[PDB]
Design an enzyme around this catalytic site. Structure first.
Site, mmCIF file in Angstrom:
data_model
loop_
_atom_site.group_PDB
_atom_site.id
_atom_site.type_symbol
_atom_site.label_atom_id
_atom_site.label_comp_id
_atom_site.label_asym_id
_atom_site.label_seq_id
_atom_site.Cartn_x
_atom_site.Cartn_y
_atom_site.Cartn_z
ATOM 1 C CG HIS A 1 -5.592 -8.698 -5.414
ATOM 2 N ND1 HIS A 1 -6.429 -7.697 -4.969
ATOM 3 C CD2 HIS A 1 -4.552 -8.076 -6.019
ATOM 4 C CE1 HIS A 1 -5.916 -6.522 -5.288
ATOM 5 N NE2 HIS A 1 -4.778 -6.725 -5.926
ATOM 6 C CD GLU B 1 -8.808 -4.807 -5.610
ATOM 7 O OE1 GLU B 1 -8.910 -5.444 -6.680
ATOM 8 O OE2 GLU B 1 -8.286 -3.677 -5.548
ATOM 9 C CE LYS C 1 -5.983 -3.600 -8.215
ATOM 10 N NZ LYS C 1 -6.176 -2.720 -7.037
ATOM 11 C CD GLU D 1 -2.367 -7.500 -2.341
ATOM 12 O OE1 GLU D 1 -3.102 -8.198 -1.611
ATOM 13 O OE2 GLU D 1 -2.675 -7.194 -3.511
ATOM 14 C CG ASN E 1 -4.377 -6.970 -10.595
ATOM 15 O OD1 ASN E 1 -5.177 -7.351 -11.447
ATOM 16 N ND2 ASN E 1 -4.658 -6.975 -9.294
ATOM 17 C CG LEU F 1 0.048 -7.483 -8.173
ATOM 18 C CD1 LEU F 1 0.210 -8.180 -9.533
ATOM 19 C CD2 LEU F 1 -0.722 -8.373 -7.202
ATOM 20 C CB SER G 1 0.275 2.900 -3.738
ATOM 21 O OG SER G 1 -0.971 2.758 -3.079
ATOM 22 N N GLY H 1 -1.138 -2.014 -9.727
ATOM 23 C CA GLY H 1 -2.554 -1.832 -9.973
ATOM 24 C C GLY H 1 -2.867 -0.812 -11.054
ATOM 25 C CG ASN H 2 -5.996 1.947 -10.322
ATOM 26 O OD1 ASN H 2 -6.621 1.018 -10.840
ATOM 27 N ND2 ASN H 2 -6.426 2.587 -9.241
ATOM 28 N N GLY I 1 -5.666 2.987 -0.280
ATOM 29 C CA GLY I 1 -6.912 3.734 -0.229
ATOM 30 C C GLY I 1 -7.309 4.161 1.173
#
Lengths: 246, 246
Positions: free
Chosen positions: B93, B95, B10, B163, B8, B228, B209, B230-231, B169
């Site tokens: 998601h 977010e 993002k 998630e 992802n 899934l 994460s 992320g960064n 975070g």
């Protein structure tokens, strides 16, 4: 002022329908230095559309993010738009304020991010039926415009759009006279908040019901400088709406 | 179950960064018939990304509309995605639930629209930090899943993603053990609301994460079928995360 006619294809199109429509649009001979004609396809259709449309046509996207690059799944940043040389973005369309809780704060922050990344913005606003029958049309419009107007630095790069919600999709119709009255009031807001030169320079488009039969009567109004056309821009006849501004 | 590793991206990427990253990804030799690897670029980056990535890599978009084609400025419908042969869509998601008021009902309607248009869906959900501290993790998860689970017809076409927002975070971290416990319950929920055969075939990915340092400990858990990412999916080392599932 230089007239501005835009096609908001909203959430419509197939690879094939776009090919046929863009071909029709390409057949219209117009001078882009005399009139701005912008097509706003769905995000995933942008590449296809930009390639199919001749260079005289400008292009943009229907929404942009207030957040920059980062952990914002599903958003398109102004930075990304700039890297792709996407020229215009629509901000505050009543459909995003209606279905996706877009606020005046969102509009303000999206405009700032856009301007910071050299994007030109088509900013929409307009009063609801209830607000109109309550005689607060100008009160509402003033508040909506003042939420972002102070951010405008170059008045050729931000285009205002009046959307008479009571006459959009309701069967009701706003007269060119009614539109003109609102457009003149909008220009006055820019004049009082920014300046006379700025007010006389900025394009204010009519974003209500526009078709081949009424486009001429609207563009003729002193303070209407073009249109943000919805569903009518999905028809080949859109070229006649463009012609009314040539 | 066929493992599923998704990237992802993002709201990140430039045309050039994507070129470099995709080149790195194409270096990995894996069998798409034995493992699913999906890349989710920004909408306007989809065409570029799909042409750059070898066919072994599957692709999709980070969000889809709860509405069909129509007057929904800024939205991308499931029908439009199907016409472009976009295979996957991410729904729910955190977010979008965090920044764009996306609700359980929105997730449901989006899943229904996706399935109706033959799209495969990666549906996300998860409890907040406060909810976990209140010991309501399973309660929350059960409600989020039951909001859309009855819509699943083919259990190879819908992929679930847990998630743990409390460890996203927040300085806090979600351990493989804690994750496995949740995944096992999620599968039980699918077993008790749908069927045992259906629960055994549906993929349940970990969406907390994920990095090269903890991916192996996660994929090893019996009820975790992929992730899934992320960064960590914005770096070449993402290939090592894929390798952990090979």
């Amino acid at each position: 002022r230089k007239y501005f006619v835009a096609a908001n294809w909203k959430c419509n199109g197939t690879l094939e329908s776009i090919k046929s429509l863009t071909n029709s649009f390409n057949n219209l001979d117009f001078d882009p230095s005399k009139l701005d004609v912008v097509v706003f396809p769905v995000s995933v259709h942008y590449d296809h559309t930009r390639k199919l449309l001749q260079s005289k046509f400008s292009t943009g996207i229907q929404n942009v993010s207030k957040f920059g690059n980062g952990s914002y799944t599903g958003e398109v940043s102004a930075e990304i738009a700039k890297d792709l040389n996407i020229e215009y973005v629509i901000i505050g369309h009543f459909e995003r304020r209606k279905y996706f809780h877009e606020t005046d704060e969102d509009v303000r922050e999206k405009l700032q991010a856009s301007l910071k990344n050299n994007l030109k913005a088509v900013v929409c606003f307009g009063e609801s039926l209830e607000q109109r029958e309550q005689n607060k049309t100008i009160e509402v419009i003033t508040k909506q415009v003042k939420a972002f107007v102070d951010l405008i630095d170059n008045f050729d790069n931000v285009i205002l759009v009046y959307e008479p919600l009571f006459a959009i999709g309701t069967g009701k119709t706003a007269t060119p006279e009614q539109a003109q009255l609102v457009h003149k009031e909008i220009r006055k807001i820019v004049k009082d908040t920014c300046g006379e030169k700025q007010a006389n320079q900025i394009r204010i488009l009519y974003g209500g019901s526009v078709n081949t039969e009424n486009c001429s009567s609207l563009i003729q109004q002193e303070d209407i400088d073009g249109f943000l056309v919805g569903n009518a821009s999905l028809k080949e006849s859109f070229v006649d709406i463009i012609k009314s501004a040539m």
